[PDB]
Design a protein around this ligand. Sequence first.
Ligand SMILES: [Mn+2]
Length: 173
Amino acid sequence: DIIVDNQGSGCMVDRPFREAIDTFHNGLRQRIAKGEAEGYGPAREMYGLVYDCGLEEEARKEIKLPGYADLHHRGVTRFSGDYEGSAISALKEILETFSADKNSMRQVVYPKATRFGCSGRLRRRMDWVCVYDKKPKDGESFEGGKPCNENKDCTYYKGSTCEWNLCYTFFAA
Ligand SMILES: [Mn+2]
């Protein structure tokens, strides 16, 4: 499992933060695909989230002007936290707390989301938002299919490569 990156330098957030949030996201999703994340239910077809610098740039607009991402029909998650130590360990913790927010986790874990980007700002407090390309609906079921081993096991989107039992597409347009 490693970060899969799409496009350029709307990626302003430093590697270790970016990789911490990405590994948290795709780490969970991978366990849920394998049906082995406690509390999340039966194995299923899961797309990995491609880290998208464009979507990180939208996340940054979203912090600057709340409501922005919804205008573009995006999923959004938010996580914050006061802290005092290293900004990097604070974030590690904030995510753990964030993982106990059942509403937020619905977006994090949505099998038909295929890309995301997050941005954060320091005020000592940190605020992060993530933008996702597909937002689940309330009551929408997440179960279905099976965890990919070969590319053919990916049904949701057309041009998908299976890797680490996660399906990846770069064209879910
Ligand atoms: Mn392969």
